[PDB]
């Protein structure tokens, strides 16, 4: 079985490279962040532009949704995160304390916490209600490229250019596992599988790997794409067939069979590096977005 993703919409409006797209948990919305300092909200099914959210003083590298789809958090080169009320567009809180660019962010499932990663080599855990920093983890010895909570929020996984993935106990901030592999290539992305048992990690040697968190073992590797320079988002697709989805520096979206590791589809149409992909929570829909020469977001639909 192979998917048949086809282009449905191209969404234009960002005036610089797009950095990150994410579907709302309720499936209604796509949020996008950009080097142009803006967040934009779009209808997930009709592609209709809904609104622009502004206030950061420099570009935004990441954005993430609360579980109830009512809040957004953004990570910016202005060294802050911001918490936004989506319906009003207002900045509820500015999270201050990182000493360099904030690169990555995520809510926990309860959505009382935010985790952030920075070029300052730290991971920070923040209280949503007060905006205070609860914990600073001395997580890595190089920029932190990704941070993600597991399905109940008890664990954080982080990745770094230092070549490590680390698993942290949320409650205590203590490191539970370090993933190392061979020649330590920079790790550009990491995230938990939906069941929380596996971790998907990208390295800047054109490689994706699936790790069993319990065992410390690599189970699958995925290759054929181009990834040497950028921190590109990758995904588990679970609404139909079980795929791995990733952007690529050859301007394509790559889709693999998770079990067999065979490439099952490449989505053509972007005209610059595909820096971000996202998988819709219930429909077989992919959102992709590209860098400077393109600046658009594409929505794609498949029967499986």
């Amino acid at each position: 079985v192979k998917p048949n993703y086809a282009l449905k919409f191209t969404l234009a409006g960002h005036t610089k490279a797009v950095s990150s797209v994410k579907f709302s948990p309720n499936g209604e919305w796509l949020a996008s962040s950009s080097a142009d300092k803006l967040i934009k909200i779009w209808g997930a099914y009709d592609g209709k532009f809904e609104k622009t959210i502004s206030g950061h003083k420099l570009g935004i590298s990441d954005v993430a949704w609360s579980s109830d789809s009512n809040l957004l958090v953004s990570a910016s080169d202005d060294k802050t995160l911001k918490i936004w009320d989506v319906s009003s567009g207002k900045c509820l809180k500015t999270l201050k304390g990182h000493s360099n660019y904030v690169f990555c962010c995520n809510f926990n499932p309860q959505s009382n916490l935010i985790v952030s990663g920075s070029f300052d080599e730290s991971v920070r855990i923040w209280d949503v209600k007060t905006g205070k920093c609860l914990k600073t983890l001395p997580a890595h010895s190089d920029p932190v490229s990704a941070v993600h909570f597991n399905r109940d929020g008890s664990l954080i996984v982080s990745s770094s250019y230092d070549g490590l993935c680390r698993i942290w106990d949320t409650a205590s901030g203590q490191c539970l596992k370090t993933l190392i592999d061979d020649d330590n290539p920079p790790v550009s992305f990491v995230k938990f599988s939906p069941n929380g048992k596996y971790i998907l990690a990208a390295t800047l040697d054109n490689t994706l790997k699936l790790w069993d968190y319990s065992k410390g073992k690599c189970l699958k590797t995925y290759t054929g794409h181009k990834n040497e320079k950028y921190c590109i988002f990758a995904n588990f697709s679970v609404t139909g067939g079980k795929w791995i989805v990733s952007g690529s520096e050859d301007n394509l979206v790559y889709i693999w069979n998770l079990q067999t590791k065979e490439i099952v589809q490449k989505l053509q149409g972007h005209t610059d590096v595909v820096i971000s992909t996202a998988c819709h929570p219930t429909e077989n829909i992919i959102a992709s977005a590209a860098l400077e020469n393109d600046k658009t977001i594409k929505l794609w639909k498949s029967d499986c």
């Binding site: 490279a17 080097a35 921190c231």
Partner: peptide, 6 residues
């Protein structure tokens, strides 16, 4: 920025 190469 994520939009700049390493």
């Amino acid at each position: 920025m994520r939009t700049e190469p390493r």
